[PDB]
């Protein structure tokens, strides 16, 4: 009985996973725009914070290569309310 039921549960898991594979392009498109949206807002509201600082170049990369480097939580959520940061950081771990 655990043969047949576990085989069935594997077919139900494949079905669950396929549905994910259908929607991933959509959630990848939204994620790309969201990331760039947040970075651009940070830059705009970081040139004004440091307009009076000598030597600062707004938006200067720390990496020599011009490749695209995925931002870490600090860069992406650096200037935001702790409500968002905490949800973005430990929200999933702490969920129940």
């Amino acid at each position: 009985s655990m043969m047949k039921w576990n085989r069935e549960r594997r077919r139900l898991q494949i079905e669950d996973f396929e549905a994910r594979i259908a929607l991933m392009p959509l959630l990848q498109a939204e994620k790309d725009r969201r990331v760039l949206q947040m970075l651009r807002e940070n830059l705009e509201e970081e040139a004004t914070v440091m307009k009076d600082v000598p030597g600062w170049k707004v938006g200067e990369s720390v990496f020599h290569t011009t490749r695209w480097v995925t931002p870490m939580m600090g860069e992406l959520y650096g200037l935001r309310a702790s409500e968002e940061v905490l949800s973005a950081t430990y929200g999933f771990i702490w969920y129940t």
């Binding site: 994910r20 990331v35 995925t70 939580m73 600090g74 702790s82």
Partner: protein, 174 residues
Amino acid sequence: MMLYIVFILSVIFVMGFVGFSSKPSPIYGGLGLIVSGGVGCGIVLNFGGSFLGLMVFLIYLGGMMVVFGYTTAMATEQYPEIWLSNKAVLGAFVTGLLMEFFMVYYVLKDKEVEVVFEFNGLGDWVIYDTGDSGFFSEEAMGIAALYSYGTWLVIVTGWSLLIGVVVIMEITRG
């Protein structure tokens, strides 16, 4: 104050270490090694180490129990020492705690400390990964791979434990 959970837990992690490193009776030393091992689960848990956090906690829990059994049998004394009943232990305990407090005060105040080496106190959240979304914990995949990938590790560890049982038989039986 919740963005600094990983820092607060680490502070307790050290405080627990100073508790048993100053070396009172192994009864309280084991107590301080239980607390450090439990908040050690807490630190590893916040980083995604759910399985790893609970394994060090569960393993160290049974480890100290045997040590409690062995202390009563062999490392006891008429007047077990606590941290406040010995000038050497109290010196080690106070020296350790103050050394930690100055670290905490400076790093928090200046958002950076330089205890020999540079450390950045913006908070541990700044370095986490921003993106992820798969039906799995990458931690479990890595540990689960120990059997398909780490055949060599399995053999040397499994062999070491088997020799471990032979070793303790020979050592104790004299």
